[PDB]
Amino acid sequence: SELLVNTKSGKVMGTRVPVLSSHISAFLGIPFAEPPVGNMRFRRPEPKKPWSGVWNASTYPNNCQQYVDEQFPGFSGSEMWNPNREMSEDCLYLNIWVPSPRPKSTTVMVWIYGGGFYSGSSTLDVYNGKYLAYTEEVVLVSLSYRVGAFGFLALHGSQEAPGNVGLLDQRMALQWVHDNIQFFGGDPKTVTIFGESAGGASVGMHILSPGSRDLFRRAILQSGSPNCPWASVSVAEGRRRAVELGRNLNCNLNSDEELIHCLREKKPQELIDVEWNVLPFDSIFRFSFVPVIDGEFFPTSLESMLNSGNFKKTQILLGVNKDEGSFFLLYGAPGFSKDSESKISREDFMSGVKLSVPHANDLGLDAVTLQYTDWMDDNNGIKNRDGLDDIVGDHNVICPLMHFVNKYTKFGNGTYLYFFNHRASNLVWPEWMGVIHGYEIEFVFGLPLVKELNYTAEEEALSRRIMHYWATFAKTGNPNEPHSQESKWPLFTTKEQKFIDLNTEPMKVHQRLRVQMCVFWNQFLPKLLNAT
Amino acid sequence: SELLVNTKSGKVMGTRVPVLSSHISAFLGIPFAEPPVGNMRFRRPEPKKPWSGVWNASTYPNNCQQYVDEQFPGFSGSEMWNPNREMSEDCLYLNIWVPSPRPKSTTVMVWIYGGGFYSGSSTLDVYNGKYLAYTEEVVLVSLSYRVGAFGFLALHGSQEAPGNVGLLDQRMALQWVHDNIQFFGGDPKTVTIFGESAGGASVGMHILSPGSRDLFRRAILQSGSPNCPWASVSVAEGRRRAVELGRNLNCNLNSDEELIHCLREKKPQELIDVEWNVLPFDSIFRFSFVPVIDGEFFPTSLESMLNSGNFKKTQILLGVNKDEGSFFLLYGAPGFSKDSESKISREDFMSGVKLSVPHANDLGLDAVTLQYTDWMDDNNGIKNRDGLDDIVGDHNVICPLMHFVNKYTKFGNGTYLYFFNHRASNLVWPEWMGVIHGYEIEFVFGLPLVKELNYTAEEEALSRRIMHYWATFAKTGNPNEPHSQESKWPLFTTKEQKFIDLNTEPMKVHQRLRVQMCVFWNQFLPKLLNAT
């Protein structure tokens, strides 16, 4: 039977699903690690023990225990990101969408969801692999990993909560795809991992980490890179937050064993209730528990790894959205509202700059303000709003990703950069937010192809273009069709630094994606803060 | 006789001179102080002792002993600024151009030449007061003062070379105009002093100094203000340079008397031969001997005086030229040539930035470079050239003058700002230099009215407009004609900050003259250098 597959872990029974008036197979909720419950909390994942009989993989698995957004109850715009399944510490499962008839050895794509390392589910609607699997004829795998304290608590030196266990979770899923995807029709020697936000940072981290390099062929990073200011902490800050977390739940703090044991007796929702209290600064776009440079997963510091060429050399395709920042200002900066044009005054502008660059002294806060203020029109509410929006995106996503793409390209074997700047016609968020963080995803998974979702004809056209780029790239290491007549997505080179825009208009190539600001955030500011 | 005038110092015999096919009186070389020779060198000026008989004031006086430019022998462009008379330490004289018939009580204008405080003569061709006196019917006075070591050597605490004796020279001339201009037809209660470059800085200094405030009614400052980074030094740096000067001439340095006496035995040309060796840094737009904040001429520091409203409150009219910097880059920065387009490379650009902001640490040099570099086109030779040109002008003339006009306007009784951006059609300097430092002067003195000089019809029209503005302002405190139909030069206010352009095109009002950069040079950079 086409829905029955025999893996090295046991037999699995999938289900047939309809897609764009046709069908494909779907094996949902296949386990890849032992349930990290009880004494296993905070600990590294262990391989799932083989099973007898047939595992029923016809329904989605549970979602990792996480923080849930309730800023806008009912609002689809924010709930489409919340977990749509029972939350449980028994979360480590993966989903596979296989074409029909089953391929013999086709290209594999493994998706890693984003969410600031504190949230995310593989089961959201926007992450439905069937449209992409079907349309491009690829095996689509979607894994899951532990988030928040559960996946990133870090008491270095201890084997009870080493840290990065959330990344080990992902590696585990990748190890399984490597050892079994062949039985699903996939070709293990041609697996592309691709992510978004924290998932984009995760992809970049497997490229840097020696232990994961041999488990994939290529990579796609969307709106996120490993060296982002929010994606990692030092073991010292990791330890500082581990303790403070324990201090909020009134736990014995005399020793790591003391602390860890107390944290293991707490109900999942109790760690999550106080999780946001450990941040060192009043900030925006920063998260409590994230990866930590431990000396294991990451040999040395990220910057020295990027400078020494110490990382997997292959091809990569990455890019960013036009307005990456707006989403975080809405939720945390004074002045912004989902229901108003949110024009910002001088006072609120500067409050925002303080919240965006939390680690900067008064001199730095001034450098940022001077760099983002048009003194001929300083009290223009629309300019202060869009200026603040730019600061958050540049410092947190764009300028960091450009530093990565530039350091990488010097040792890589091919780079392709994009700039997604198209606002979907059916977006429910206000206009001032623009091309929002994470909304390019729907085009990657092809939601525009399903009529009922209400997308324009050109938006469906854009979705197919992108799906063919990602898929053609996953297969060949080049997003372009061999002998096509269409426009060629030029290659990014240290010299030219070309890139293309991604929207419903005739392709246009450009150069030096936001150089003016990227030099400020990557060269000047760092230097200034270090001298002062 | 109309050419004979009896002053409080003695009788003076002037001469009749032709102007624009007509005539006026001219009393040239009237003395106002005792010859500062011998033991009087470096010392404060003493009033000229009355004389019997008639002083012959029909020919120009000598020029102060100064450094002479020989960078371009023969070139009119640079020689029209060199002394056109025998140089001598016996230099303190003034020139008066009086209308015919002699006025009973008309408006007076006293001109103070510029020259970096190290050069300048009142007898240059471009400073011929007859055209202006004639055309606007005003008494035009032109004084002279000691420059270089001779007028600014400063060994604070000693009465042999107190410092600022060059400014005392100017004050002396003003005291005489105040006590005698009435006998020439002038009205002493309506004297406007106006200068350019070092002279613009001098005008601003009489506005700040308690001792000179009561000697004039209004003021005009062109391309220069008292708080310019090159216009003054601390008593410590003044003392440091005084000594080093003495060290170059092998003088006994055991005591001030020791030093001063040795310097008084040296021929004038020997101090000038080594004068440029005392500058503390390899620099551009900086001069050896300049005014010094001594606590006498200047009660306290300039910045605190400007903040406390401690200065003469009246009306002022000031402005700058579009390309104030080019002239100094030509003479001192690597890459520029009088005969080439002078396109600058990245290396020479940065060499230039080092030469322009000599007092900045490596962090500052980077802030300046980042602020003046278009990273989308970093190797554009024309952009690096014009960028360097902007740095020199902004930091040395424009941003400092805007700081003055803003601090002043808060306590003044009327401010009028202009921006001269017209390049004369007969300029002999290369095009890349643009609207050069000091070339607005020719329009102020009306050289365009004399055909033989080869100016366009619109340039002569511009010259008359400016001459009427300066003159109408000197008389009324407003450059505008009471009930005119012409365009009104709006008033500058703390709120609006309006200003006008000055060229052969229909007047256009603007706002915030170069705010973006003025904030960098007046607020951020200062602060950065202080914290680091």
From Swiss-Prot, chains A, B:
Pfam families: COesterase
Gene3D superfamilies linked to this entry: alpha/beta hydrolase (3.40.50.1820)
EC number: 3.1.1.7
GO molecular function, one term: acetylcholinesterase activity
Catalyses which reaction(s): acetylcholine + H2O = choline + acetate + H(+)
Tissue specificity statement from the Swiss-Prot or TrEMBL entry: Found in the synapses and to a lower extent in extrajunctional areas of muscle and nerve, and on erythrocyte membranes.
Annotated phenotype, changing E196 to Q/D: Decrease in activity
GO terms (BP aspect): acetylcholine catabolic process in synaptic cleft; choline metabolic process
Effect of S197V: Loss of activity
Gene Ontology, cellular component aspect: extracellular space; plasma membrane; side of membrane; synapse; synaptic cleft
Activity regulation: Inhibited by substrate concentrations above 0.5 mM.
Active-site residues, Swiss-Prot/TrEMBL: S197, E324, H437
InterPro entries: AB_hydrolase_fold, AChE-related_enzymes, Acylcholinesterase_fish/snake, CarbesteraseB, Carboxylesterase_B_AS, Carboxylesterase_B_CS, Cholinesterase
Keyword line: Cell membrane, Disulfide bond, Glycoprotein, GPI-anchor, Hydrolase, Lipoprotein, Membrane, Neurotransmitter degradation, Serine esterase, Signal, Synapse
Glycosylation sites: N56, N413, N454, N530
Domain of life: Eukaryota
Disulfide bond residue pairs: C64-C91, C251-C262, C399-C518
Subunit record text: Isoform H form is a homodimer; the asymmetric form is a disulfide-bonded oligomer composed of a collagenic subunit (Q) and a variable number of T catalytic subunits.
Function: Terminates signal transduction at the neuromuscular junction by rapid hydrolysis of the acetylcholine released into the synaptic cleft. May be involved in cell-cell interactions.
Family: Belongs to the type-B carboxylesterase/lipase family.
Protein name as it appears in the record: Acetylcholinesterase
Gene behind the chain: ache
